[PDB]
Write a protein that binds this ligand. Structure first.
Ligand SMILES: [Cl-]
Length: 290
């Protein structure tokens, strides 16, 4: 699995802040927009993009405050990410798109799709954000960790001071052993502790046990939209997973309209790091059927 990031930097001014993005492939079709989550960047798509780039334009932004994008003084609430991603999409003059989304990137993607349904021609997704009614519906072995994350004193000591989301949570979400070189790519944006705000706010925005109520409502709304939409859907899943267990993936494949599910093999949260070639090749094949 490739550790390099052989992509020229592209930058666009978005609400007065510079955002970085990968942009490769031809301008003669429908672009494919790749959205990463927490605590990753466009680096997470590095081995998937090469399967798609020969036939379709691949656009992979770094969320505001992450990757090579600027780091404004924000709270980095989901509202901030929604605002900046909305403006990113408009700054690139995108019309219709295909979405490839993961983790907090899936919340952005589904929320954008709900509000712009005529402009989404397909959604590939994996390990995505859905409402978590109670802490019993959160993964058993990550309950104590994320409960600790969702506090001001303990959570910030862990995530901001000790950088545990990068040093611990990230590699623990990959079944195979992430290499030092790969870890260093993921570490790059957060070498300064003050820049780790998004890493702590994100888990505090997760819709768990009815809080934060506004996120729970937003996520419920786009899940309702997804269940009602005829848009082509491609769901990647792994065993045992984290956000999406195998049993949930099978249920979603039946319940969501026009949905194909693909087993990547062993996987936790960062499925892209465990089977990029299958994810890439299947997206490429799926795109040709659209
Ligand atoms: Cl998170």
């Amino acid at each position: 699995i490739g550790t390099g990031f052989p992509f020229d930097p592209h930058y666009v001014e978005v609400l007065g802040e510079r955002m970085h993005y990968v942009d490769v492939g031809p301008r003669d079709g429908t672009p494919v927009l790749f959205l990463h989550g927490n605590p990753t960047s466009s680096y997470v798509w590095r081995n998937i993009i090469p399967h798609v780039a020969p036939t379709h334009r691949c656009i992979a932004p770094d969320l505001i405050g992450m990757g090579k994008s600027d780091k404004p003084d924000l709270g980095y609430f989901f509202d901030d990410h929604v605002r900046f991603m909305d403006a990113f999409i408009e700054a690139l003059g995108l019309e219709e798109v295909v979405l490839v989304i993961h983790d907090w990137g899936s919340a952005l993607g589904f929320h954008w799709a709900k509000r712009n349904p005529e402009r989404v021609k397909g959604i590939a997704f994996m390990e995505f954000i859905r409402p978590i009614p109670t802490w019993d519906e959160w993964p058993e072995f990550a309950r104590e960790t994320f409960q600790a994350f969702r506090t001001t004193d303990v959570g910030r000591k862990l995530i901001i001071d000790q950088n545990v989301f990068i040093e611990g949570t990230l590699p623990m979400g990959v079944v195979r052993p992430l290499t030092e070189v790969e870890m260093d790519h993921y570490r790059e944006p957060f070498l300064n502790p003050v820049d780790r705000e998004p890493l702590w706010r994100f888990p505090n925005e997760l819709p768990i046990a009815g809080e934060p109520a506004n996120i729970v409502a937003l996520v419920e709304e786009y899940m309702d939209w997804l269940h009602q939409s005829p848009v082509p859907k491609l769901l990647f899943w792994g065993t045992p997973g984290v956000l999406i267990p195998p049993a949930e993936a099978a249920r979603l494949a039946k319940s969501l309209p026009n949905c194909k599910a693909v087993d990547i093999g062993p996987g936790l949260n960062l499925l892209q790091e465990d089977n990029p070639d299958l994810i890439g090749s299947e997206i490429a094949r799926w795109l040709s059927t659209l």
